[PDB]
Amino acid sequence: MLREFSFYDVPPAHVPPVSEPLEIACYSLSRDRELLLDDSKLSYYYPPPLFSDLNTGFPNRFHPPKSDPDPISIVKDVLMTKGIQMNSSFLTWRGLITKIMCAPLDPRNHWETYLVMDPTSGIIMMEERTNQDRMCYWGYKFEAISTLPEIWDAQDVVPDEQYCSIVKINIGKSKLILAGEVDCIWDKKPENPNLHYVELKTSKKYPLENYGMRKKLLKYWAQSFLLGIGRIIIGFRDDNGILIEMKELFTHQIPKMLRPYFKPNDWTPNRLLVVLEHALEWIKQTVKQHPPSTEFTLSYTGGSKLVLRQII
Ligand SMILES: Cc1cc2nc3c(=O)[nH]c(=O)nc-3n(C[C@H](O)[C@H](O)[C@H](O)COP(=O)(O)OP(=O)(O)OC[C@H]3O[C@@H](n4cnc5c(N)ncnc54)[C@H](O)[C@@H]3OP(=O)(O)O)c2cc1C
Numbered sequence: 001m002l003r004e005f006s007f008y009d010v011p012p013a014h015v016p017p018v019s020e021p022l023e024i025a026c027y028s029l030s031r032d033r034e035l036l037l038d039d040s041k042l043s044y045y046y047p048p049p050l051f052s053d054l055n056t057g058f059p060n061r062f063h064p065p066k067s068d069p070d071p072i073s074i075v076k077d078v079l080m081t082k083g084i085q086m087n088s089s090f091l092t093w094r095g096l097i098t099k100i101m102c103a104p105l106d107p108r109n110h111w112e113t114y115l116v117m118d119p120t121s122g123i124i125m126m127e128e129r130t131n132q133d134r135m136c137y138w139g140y141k142f143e144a145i146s147t148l149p150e151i152w153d154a155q156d157v158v159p160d161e162q163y164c165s166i167v168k169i170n171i172g173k174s175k176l177i178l179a180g181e182v183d184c185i186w187d188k189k190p191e192n193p194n195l196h197y198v199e200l201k202t203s204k205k206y207p208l209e210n211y212g213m214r215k216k217l218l219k220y221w222a223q224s225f226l227l228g229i230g231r232i233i234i235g236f237r238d239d240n241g242i243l244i245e246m247k248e249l250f251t252h253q254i255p256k257m258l259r260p261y262f263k264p265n266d267w268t269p270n271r272l273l274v275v276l277e278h279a280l281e282w283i284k285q286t287v288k289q290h291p292p293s294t295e296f297t298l299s300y301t302g303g304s305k306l307v308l309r310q311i312i
């Protein structure tokens, strides 16, 4: 027995309201994976030298990332440890909402998540249960050379070391608690901090007329939008992996920058939000229609549809 949700069955609607994502907790992960309830792993952004060689250190200074999905119970336990109550509809990693939201854009990227409603809180928890080639290293390396740790109050490329923000964000009728990795911060951490946060990306530069470039930027936007990240800073590199150009974007500016280039068919920020809000309402309706602790999988395998299965 399958339940299916059609991207294209969603009528043209007004873009749903989305609240300013509010940080309710944060934590750091040491290089050794120790989970610390502090900001010791929040780094500051500082522009690296132009023509930096992103190959430097690959592979002998590269500690490849863990490469196993993290259970979302980590985040539930963080909130429990700090005595924060979960009064929302969804609890998951930011990147798993990005996957739902951007699925219309990415027929090639197939994924599967696991959902269970928590019996005490009633929130729907979602996780994966199921990245270190030279291309990804350039990404990790750009993050490394573009950041500065806290020093006053306190090289190898260790993507396992991370800072994480946990936000409350409302998308239409769905209240979500989302945990996501924050690459660094623009200035002193305050007022809600997320607009101060920065996402770092590395990419070849293509014109905005290029459909692939637009799709990539839309995914950049979606990711940072879901965590309230104020800035996305792109290190443009050439085919040799040399840093050529720094581009500082404000997240809210990406939908504006792309407006003159969308073709009449294209997926737009507003269309993506409309569909996402319908998908979330559908997931919620389907799950709540059962007793808590019932396990489901949410799958996308190409085409136009999400499929929710009850696990037995
Ligand atoms: C089989 C499998 C292996 C995974 N291995 C890792 C891992 O080694 N480290 C990790 O942080 N998360 C890994 N994940 C994903 C985590 O379970 C979790 O969803 C995620 O870490 C939550 O953090 P978000 O900030 O919401 O992740 P996202 O919004 O999805 O991505 C943010 C950043 O997390 C990093 N990241 C995300 N996914 C992976 C991945 N699959 N492998 C390596 N780095 C990744 C990467 O630097 C990425 O930056 P960028 O987008 O610029 O490339 C894995 C998932 C699966 C299914």
Ligand SMILES: [Mg+2]
Pocket: 143, 159, 161, 162, 181, 183
């Ligand atoms: Mg990182």
Ligand SMILES: [Mg+2]
Pocket: 143, 183, 199, 200, 201
């Ligand atoms: Mg990044």
